[PDB]
Write an enzyme that holds these catalytic residues in place. Structure first.
Site, mmCIF file in Angstrom:
data_model
loop_
_atom_site.group_PDB
_atom_site.id
_atom_site.type_symbol
_atom_site.label_atom_id
_atom_site.label_comp_id
_atom_site.label_asym_id
_atom_site.label_seq_id
_atom_site.Cartn_x
_atom_site.Cartn_y
_atom_site.Cartn_z
ATOM 1 N N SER A 113 0.786 -1.227 0.000
ATOM 2 C CA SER A 113 0.000 0.000 0.000
ATOM 3 C C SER A 113 0.823 1.285 0.000
ATOM 4 O O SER A 113 0.237 2.343 -0.239
ATOM 5 C CB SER A 113 -0.941 0.027 1.207
ATOM 6 O OG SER A 113 -2.198 -0.539 0.933
ATOM 7 N N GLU A 140 -4.410 -7.171 -6.496
ATOM 8 C CA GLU A 140 -3.407 -8.107 -7.037
ATOM 9 C C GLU A 140 -1.975 -7.674 -6.743
ATOM 10 O O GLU A 140 -1.077 -8.519 -6.703
ATOM 11 C CB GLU A 140 -3.481 -8.262 -8.564
ATOM 12 C CG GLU A 140 -4.781 -8.141 -9.274
ATOM 13 C CD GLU A 140 -5.130 -6.686 -9.693
ATOM 14 O OE1 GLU A 140 -4.504 -6.137 -10.678
ATOM 15 O OE2 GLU A 140 -6.048 -6.126 -9.009
HETATM 16 C C1 LIG Z 1 -4.632 -7.757 1.845
HETATM 17 C C2 LIG Z 1 -4.399 -6.336 2.301
HETATM 18 C C3 LIG Z 1 -5.142 -6.179 3.633
HETATM 19 S S1 LIG Z 1 -4.228 -7.157 4.884
HETATM 20 C C4 LIG Z 1 -4.835 -5.481 1.099
HETATM 21 O O1 LIG Z 1 -5.608 -5.932 0.331
HETATM 22 N N1 LIG Z 1 -4.293 -4.180 0.773
HETATM 23 C C5 LIG Z 1 -3.322 -3.552 1.635
HETATM 24 B B1 LIG Z 1 -2.269 -2.697 0.849
HETATM 25 O O2 LIG Z 1 -1.159 -2.584 1.556
HETATM 26 O O3 LIG Z 1 -2.031 -2.803 -0.475
HETATM 27 C C6 LIG Z 1 -4.042 -2.748 2.747
HETATM 28 C C7 LIG Z 1 -3.770 -3.071 4.076
HETATM 29 C C8 LIG Z 1 -4.398 -2.418 5.122
HETATM 30 C C9 LIG Z 1 -5.311 -1.426 4.844
HETATM 31 F F1 LIG Z 1 -5.931 -0.799 5.884
HETATM 32 C C10 LIG Z 1 -5.601 -1.102 3.523
HETATM 33 C C11 LIG Z 1 -4.966 -1.758 2.472
#
Ligand SMILES: C[C@H](CS)C(=O)N[C@@H](B(O)O)c1ccc(F)cc1
Length: 263
Positions: free
Chosen positions: A44, A142
């Site tokens: 992220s 993804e």
């Molecule tokens: C699987 C994972 C959640 S554990 C996800 O899909 N996206 C991540 B990101 O880092 O790209 C993420 C993690 C925490 C958040 F609050 C928002 C987004």
């Protein structure tokens, strides 16, 4: 490199995976490095740079930031709390950028990536400020595969720190745009147990986190303002070689500490 790498090597061995660190004191020029040249998944944390790509356009497109986007429900991939909340009103490009940064909002990241021409477009922006390491290839979710040795959606801690310094403290963005990016970072809500936990609570911090959900891959980068001094820019990335491996905010905090105490 680092001639006192031992503290980091021990931390890494205890964690079981890979730690990546690159810290810079802007005032002195000192740096701390550990796997700073090696690729780690962005997860992220690309969203921070995304909002900066947005603020950069807004210098040529006036009113881009105030543009409302009336997105639909099938924009709402998991982990889109702000988007979910505001489905019925839509949200402005600014609010999307804000939510991208301060909540890691997935849907809002995808909506901005679209406005910029997708991962290749964000990647073009970063090439244009001198980052030849950063590459975004994929959309949320993804891009979180964090497969060992996959170069897709990766950068290096040093190129993340060097780009962050350019956009928050140097010349890559116009002064207001620059102030908005620093302000967005300062209002982050997701980074309290990572770099922020390593900083003394008297220092202003802005950070952006990433968390892939797999392969113990998690990260955070930050500008930190010491008392009386030029700011410090740092990045701390992690990964682990088993898909099952749990990431660790503690290790990110600890490694940030070791960098800060090194400086
Ligand atoms: C699987 C994972 C959640 S554990 C996800 O899909 N996206 C991540 B990101 O880092 O790209 C993420 C993690 C925490 C958040 F609050 C928002 C987004």
């Amino acid at each position: 490199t680092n001639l006192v790498a031992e503290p980091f090597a021990k931390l890494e061995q205890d964690f079981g995976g890979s730690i990546g660190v690159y810290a810079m004191d802007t005032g002195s020029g000192a740096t701390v490095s550990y796997r700073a040249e090696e690729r780690f998944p962005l997860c992220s944390s690309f969203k921070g740079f995304l909002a900066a790509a947005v603020l950069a356009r807004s210098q040529q497109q006036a009113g881009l930031l105030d543009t409302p986007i009336r997105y639909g429900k099938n924009a709402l991939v998991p982990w889109s709390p702000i988007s979910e909340k505001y489905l019925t009103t839509g949200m402005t490009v600014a609010e999307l950028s804000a939510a991208a940064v301060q909540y890691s909002d997935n849907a809002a990241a995808n909506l901005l990536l679209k406005e910029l021409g997708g991962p290749a477009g964000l990647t073009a922006f970063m090439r244009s400020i001198g980052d030849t390491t950063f590459r975004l290839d994929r959309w949320e979710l993804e891009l979180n595969s964090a497969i060992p040795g996959d170069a897709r959606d990766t950068s290096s801690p040093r190129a993340v720190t060097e780009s962050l310094q350019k956009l928050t403290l140097g010349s890559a963005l116009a002064a207001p745009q620059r102030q908005q990016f620093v302000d967005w970072l300062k209002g982050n809500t997701t980074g309290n147990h990572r770099i922020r936990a390593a900083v003394p609570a008297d220092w202003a911090v802005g950070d952006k986190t990433g968390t892939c959900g797999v392969y113990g891959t998690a990260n955070d980068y930050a500008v930190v303002w010491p008392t009386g001094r030029a700011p410090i820019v740092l990045a701390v990335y992690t990964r682990a070689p088993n898909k099952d491996d749990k990431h660790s905010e503690a290790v990110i905090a600890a490694a940030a500490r070791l960098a800060l105490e090194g400086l």
